[PDB]
């Protein structure tokens, strides 16, 4: 079981409350205009997003994990060099899709937080795409199974994820609906489907 701020004992109740509360926050991040104020393409901006979503639930929100994490078929950056690997990602270029995908693949391997990495880094990605290409991802054009397979392959070859991203881009960078739908899809990629962000 994981430590939380709401004194929850059940993992299934914790999943439900985390989903509702962080989704409420994600909706606020957008409607408040705070999303537009965040620094783009940096760990400082990523940390801002992660804290915005998870701060009422977890003590660690926005903070770099102090311990090693293992899940999936590739290793995440070991804590022995995670800090300097984040300094390296901050220095990576973001001029074109090749560079944006390569930067994103590295941030996914870093997986700097205890949890919520996927959800926060997808918001973070869309902002880089918004600033540099004047595009966002229509996450509705990316299937869960395709996405998950493409992400697992990415440490070896970023082609599959670059293809899914390239083909889902839209110039509708200020469309609230693309955003809100993307939150619900991002959460679904991680198994959280109890709520709809626009009903919150």
Author numbering: 8 to 207
Article, verbatim:
The most frequent PTM reaction catalyzed by FIC enzymes is the addition of AMP using ATP as a cofactor, coined AMPylation or adenylylation. Enterococcus faecalis FIC belongs to class III FIC proteins, which are comprised of a single FIC domain and carry an autoinhibitory glutamate in their C-terminal α-helix. We discover that EfFIC has both AMPylation and deAMPylation activities borne by the same active site. Furthermore, the conserved glutamate implements a Ca2+-controlled metal switch that tunes the balance between these activities without conformational change.
We determined crystal structures of unbound, phosphate-bound, AMP-bound, and ATPγS-bound wild-type EfFIC (EfFICWT) and of unbound and sulfate-bound EfFIC carrying a mutation of the catalytic histidine into an alanine (EfFICH111A). All EfFIC monomers resemble closely to each other and to structures of other class III FIC proteins. Notably, the C-terminal α-helix that bears the inhibitory glutamate (E190) shows no tendency for structural flexibility, even in molecules where it is free of crystalline contacts. E190 has the same conformation as in other glutamate-bearing FIC protein structures and is stabilized by a salt bridge with Arg122 and, when present, by interactions with the nucleotide cofactor. EfFIC forms equivalent dimers in all crystal forms, but the arrangement of these dimers in higher-order assemblies varies between crystals. Depending on the crystal forms, EfFIC does not form assemblies larger than the dimers or forms tetramers related to the NmFIC tetramer or forms hexamers comprised of trimers of dimers, making it difficult to establish the functional oligomeric state based on the crystallographic assemblies.
